[PDB]
Amino acid sequence: PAIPEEVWNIKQMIKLTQEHIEALLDKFEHNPPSIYLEAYEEYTSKLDALQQREQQLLES
Numbered sequence: 001p002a003i004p005e006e007v008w009n010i011k012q013m014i015k016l017t018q019e020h021i022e023a024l025l026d027k028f029e030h031n032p033p034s035i036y037l038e039a040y041e042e043y044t045s046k047l048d049a050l051q052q053r054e055q056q057l058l059e060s
Contacts, residue, residue: 002060010054017047 021043024036 004057007054007057010050010057014047014050014054017043017050021047 021040024040024043027036
C-alpha cells in the first residue's frame, strides 16, 4: 500500500539480525576467537545494509 511491503520485511530482518548479534555477544571470554569477532563484523555490516535499503525505500 502506502508503505512497500518490503519495508516491513526488512524491519523483520533487522530485528532477526540484532537478535543474532546479541546471541553472538552472549558467547564472549578473554581472548575471544577470531571466528566470533569476524561474524560480529559480518552481521553488523548486514545490519547497515538492511538499514540503507530501508531508508532508500522510504522515498514516499
